[PDB]
Write a protein that binds this ligand. Structure first.
Ligand code: JBZ
Ligand code: JBZ
Lengths: 213, 209
């Protein structure tokens, strides 16, 4: 398909390598376009302020609603899927990536400090689809690394752009530092090979991810 | 003091680390440890299957030079143990992390097996989705760990700042009241509501759908 992704951030250089990692063939065929925008373009003052103190007290700072509102007004339309990475979000999974892979337009809003004033997402949700998501149970400094992960996971599911656990894999040489490749893999018995791989998958899932069982 | 070494066939993809003397980060091109003209690092899998596997020989030579017996070797993979906030706290007091980034369908299993005979090894997943390689996972792990380095339950609720009315939407009036007890209670109730709706697993309830 043809997908446009806009990313808004106070650290636009963070996103530049993924921009360049796009294959020319996909860009030239108009299959994908990733654009990155400096949030400070929409600030109101000579000091280019994007943050302010939290109502109700507490540590850190909160990103200003007036700046974010102006940025999203310009970039989003009614057809936009607005993605807001946050530790308090719904889980982003492979199922999510498959769903988003058929979208015409994703906009990813990257927070810093303690996050974005909640009225920004609440206002946007009255005229477009909004999704607050987390990429895992750890705390980052901001949304930029989450945006990188989401872009990679989604775009590899777009044609021509980019349960049990998988078991161990092997290639040449057949013997290395005293360790031989499991002989069953060189046996030419492909039903037996499939059964061996299934059992390796079972054992690894029990050991590393008992939640999946 | 922490040293982090990252090994990858795409060193350019790690440039965003430059977010910043208590920690040093270095990035290495895996292909520098090859000896042939085509600099090949991959071949077809034994036993069949799609795609290619990274050869153990080149990885062995790279890690021989970079690692010591005190190194914690980190290998991002979808088949890993989960990387969580607990993991980040644990790794925050390490002297030396080495992060090995896979491409293609992954790395020959004997690389981790051989390394484990001389150092501690951790295969980890940063979440249940598929990347094209280990590089983005390395960036996530580095950011989560470095913010906990000495000298550097429930979901968080919503945050607000000025102005107190915007586009006809009000900041919750309790937050303007100056009543610490009432503010703490409201914030606790917002967090409860959020966790039940979005992450019921954190409170010991079934996950949706
Ligand atoms: C302030 O912006 C943030 C901070 C932490 C954070 N952590 C995420 C995660 O997905 O784990 S997204 C995100 C956004
Ligand atoms: C081939 O190297 C890969 C590929 C996908 C992948 N996915 C990860 C994740 O943690 O979800 S780590 C990782 C490494």
């Amino acid at each position: 398909g043809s997908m446009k992704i806009d990313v808004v951030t106070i650290f636009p250089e963070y996103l530049q390598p993924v921009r360049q990692s796009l294959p020319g063939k996909a860009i030239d065929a108009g299959l994908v376009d990733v654009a990155v925008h400096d949030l400070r373009r929409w600030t109101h003052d000579v000091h280019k302020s994007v943050d302010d103190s939290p109502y109700g007290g507490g540590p850190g700072m909160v990103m200003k609603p007036t700046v974010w509102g102006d940025a999203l007004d310009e970039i989003c339309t009614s057809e936009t899927l607005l993605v807001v990475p946050t530790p308090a979000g719904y889980p982003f999974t492979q199922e999510t990536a498959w769903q988003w892979s058929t979208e015409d337009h994703l906009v990813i809003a990257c927070g810093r400090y303690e996050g974005i004033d909640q009225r920004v997402a609440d206002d946007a949700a009255t005229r477009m689809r909004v999704r607050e998501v987390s990429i895992g149970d750890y705390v980052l400094n901001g949304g930029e690394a989450a945006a990188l992960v989401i872009i990679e996971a989604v775009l590899r599911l777009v044609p021509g752009v980019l349960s049990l656990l998988e078991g161990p894999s092997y290639t040449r040489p057949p013997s290395w530092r005293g360790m031989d490749v499991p002989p069953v893999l060189l046996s030419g018995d492909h039903a037996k090979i499939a059964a061996w791989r299934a059992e390796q998958s079972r054992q690894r899932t029990i050991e590393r991810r008992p939640d999946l069982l």
